[PDB]
C-alpha cells in the first residue's frame, strides 16, 4: 500500500473521530486566558484540535509526523498545566492520547513504508 498522499485523508478521518469523543471537548479550541489567567506563564506554545484541522486543510503539514508532533503538544500542554494527576481535564487528555496513539500508529507506518518504496531504486 504505497500511496505517499494517503495519510492526509486518514488524519482527517481520525480528527473527525476525536471531535465525536466527549473527551476532546476541552481541547477542541484554543484555551481562553480570561478563565485561565496564568496559562501563558506556564505554556509557551498553545495548541488545540481546531488549529491542527485548519493546518491540515490549509496544506501546511508536509507529513503525518508533523501533525503527530502538534497533537502530542496538546497533551504535553495539558500535563504541564495540570495542578494534579487526578484532575478532570488531564484525565480526559490521557484517555484521548491513548486513543490517538492507537489510531496514528498505522498512519505513520504506512507513510514511512510508502516513502521507502518511492526511493527503492
Ligand atoms: O479552557 C481550556 N480549553 C478550552 C475549553 C475548556 C472546556 C471547554 S472549551 N482548557 C483546556 C486545556 N487546559 C488543561 O489542559 C488543563 C486544565 C486543568 C488541568 S489541565 C486548560 C483549560
From Swiss-Prot:
- Phosphoserine is found on 1, 91
UniProt superkingdom: Eukaryota
Q: Which residues form the Bromo domain?
A: 2-107
List localization entries: Nucleus
May I ask which residue range the UniProt record assigns to the signal sequence?
Answer: none
Positions of post-translational Phosphothreonine modification: 45
Tissue-specific expression: Expressed in myeloma and epidermoid carcinoma cell lines.
Quaternary assembly: Interacts with IRS1 and IRS2. Interacts (via bromo domain) with acetylated lysine residues on histone H1.4, histone H3 and H4 (in vitro).
Function of this protein?
Probable regulator of the insulin and insulin-like growth factor signaling pathways. Stimulates cell proliferation through regulation of cyclin transcription and has an anti-apoptotic activity through AKT1 phosphorylation and activation. Plays a role in the regulation of cell morphology and cytoskeletal organization.
Q: Which disease is it linked to?
A: Chung-Jansen syndrome: An autosomal dominant disorder characterized by developmental delay, intellectual disability, autistic features, anxiety, hypotonia, obesity, and dysmorphic features.
Q: What is this protein called?
A: PH-interacting protein
Q: Which gene encodes it?
A: PHIP
